[PDB]
């Protein structure tokens, strides 16, 4: 019975730690996943704007080769 008593409190500690652990890891993964996604969305935005600049160069270029 003494050994059973030890196993019960050890189980409670284990499960409590496992809950803390999985919560810590689950959260860290979410914030990482969110950081990548938001950055990837902003990066795609700038890239589209940066080819509007390249396009504008090509347009001004096309006007000099117009004369």
């Amino acid at each position: 019975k003494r050994e059973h008593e030890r196993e019960v409190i050890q189980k409670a500690i284990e499960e409590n730690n496992n809950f803390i652990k999985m919560a810590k890891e689950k959260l860290a993964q979410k914030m990482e996943s969110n950081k990548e996604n938001r950055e990837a969305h902003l990066a795609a935005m700038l890239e589209r704007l940066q080819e509007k600049d390249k396009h504008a160069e090509e347009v001004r270029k096309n006007k000099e080769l117009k004369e």
Binding site: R2, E5, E7, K11, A12, I13
Partner: protein
């Protein structure tokens, strides 16, 4: 033959304090711990419960236990709060949340060693320790969970000593939480194995007595504890005063327990009285005998006519005709011989004590080992199953490390106990 007293949890300490209050008055001990009585009968066996101190001061051999300081702080400021040895106050701060697991496995396991240090300190002062008596409820967390943990560890360190308990059974009529049947079933499992004598004090019976008989519209715990303290005084009379019958805890056990697991007793008492309500008319002996046997006077909500008495101990108190007592005691057995097992000859024993309790000129305390007690455990088992079949409220327990299997085992063992009682009812 010294007895070490232990009171655990809210209920345990509230009836435990009331108990020391009542018998201290009977032994002529004031809150200071000084004796002021007129009879030498009072002091002859006062060593059973009291330690002798400086200035011929008497100090209860009592250990107060709880996982929160609330109730024990109320004890220390109560009437006889100062009589208790301050070092014997052993308490945590976290409480048990009416949770058996917390009392037995986590919160209580942290405190139990401190308690056993005090038990041990008391035990070595004893010339010849006969055993322990515990007061507690089975419906909460501390008294139920930690109390049975204490019992198990006391048995480990004192396996040749008698363990006795006053165990308050939970009832929906007087209920704090829904998980009381869980806590109680887990506790009964412990009690069946690790005590020699258990007085089953049913809150259901205590309520019904207050309502139906004492005509108290809305009884409080204080009212309920009037009955408990009266009963506790009576069932320990033979241990506290000189006598030849059931004078120690072991001889009581040998006379009351034909089979080791069947050691759960129905206490009874007469006359039933409410607090303050003064009684002017003293009962005749026939009246005491009839009442103390009536179901309306049993402290366990069981019908004794639904079972058979294995053994009975009776203790009449006051100035009376001991011949009239023996006549009336013999009449009950001879008129209702069917309700006593024929295969235990002369299973009813009677004692008499000249000193009556306070406020009554005479009284009778009943201690029955009836198979009808199964009705108490069946009732708990039904309430247990109703929730357990849906695993309801179990997360409170699994959260402290407990597994469902342990509930199943406890359930099975109590149902076994029931069937054992049924086996002898049809013998």
């Amino acid at each position: 033959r010294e007895i070490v007293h232990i009171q655990a949890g809210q209920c345990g300490n509230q009836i435990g304090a009331k108990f020391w209050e009542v018998i201290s008055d009977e032994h002529g001990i004031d809150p200071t711990g000084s004796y002021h009585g007129d009879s030498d009968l009072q002091l002859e066996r006062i060593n059973v419960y009291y330690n002798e101190a400086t200035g011929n001061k008497y100090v209860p051999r009592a250990i107060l236990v709880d996982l929160e300081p609330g109730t024990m702080d109320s004890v220390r400021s109560g009437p006889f709060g100062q009589i208790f040895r301050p070092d014997n106050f052993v308490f945590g701060q976290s409480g048990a949340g009416n949770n058996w697991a917390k009392g037995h496995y986590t919160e209580g396991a942290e405190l139990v060693d401190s308690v056993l240090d005090v038990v041990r300190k008391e035990s070595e002062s004893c010339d010849c320790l006969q055993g322990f008596q515990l007061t507690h409820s089975l419906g909460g967390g501390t008294g139920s969970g930690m109390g049975t943990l204490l019992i198990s560890k006391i048995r480990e360190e004192y396996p040749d000593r008698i363990m006795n308990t006053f165990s308050v059974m939970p009832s929906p009529k007087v209920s704090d939480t829904v998980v009381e049947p869980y806590n109680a079933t887990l506790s009964v499992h412990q009690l069946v194995e690790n005590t020699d004598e258990t007085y089953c004090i049913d809150n259901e019976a205590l309520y019904d007595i207050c309502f139906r008989t004492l005509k108290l519209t809305t009884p409080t715990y204080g009212d309920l504890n009037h009955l408990v303290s009266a009963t506790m005084s009576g069932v320990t009379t033979c241990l506290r005063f000189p006598g030849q019958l059931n004078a120690d805890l072991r001889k009581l056990a040998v006379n009351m327990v034909p089979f080791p697991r069947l050691h759960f007793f129905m206490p009874g008492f007469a006359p039933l009285t409410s607090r303050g309500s003064q009684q002017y008319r003293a009962l005749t002996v026939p009246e005491l005998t009839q009442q103390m046997f009536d179901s309306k006077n049993m402290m366990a909500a069981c019908d004794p006519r639904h079972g058979r008495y294995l053994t009975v101990a009776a203790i009449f108190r006051g100035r009376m005709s001991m011949k009239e007592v023996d006549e009336q005691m013999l009449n009950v057995q001879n008129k209702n011989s069917s309700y006593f097992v024929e295969w235990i000859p002369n299973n009813v024993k009677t004692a008499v004590c000249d000193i009556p309790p306070r406020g009554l000129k005479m009284s009778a305390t009943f201690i029955g080992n009836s198979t009808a007690i199964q009705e108490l455990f069946k009732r708990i088992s039904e309430q247990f199953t109703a929730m357990f079949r849906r695993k309801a409220f179990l997360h409170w327990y699994t959260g402290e490390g407990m597994d469902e299997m342990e509930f199943t085992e406890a359930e099975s063992n109590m149902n076994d106990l029931v069937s054992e009682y049924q086996q002898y009812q049809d013998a």
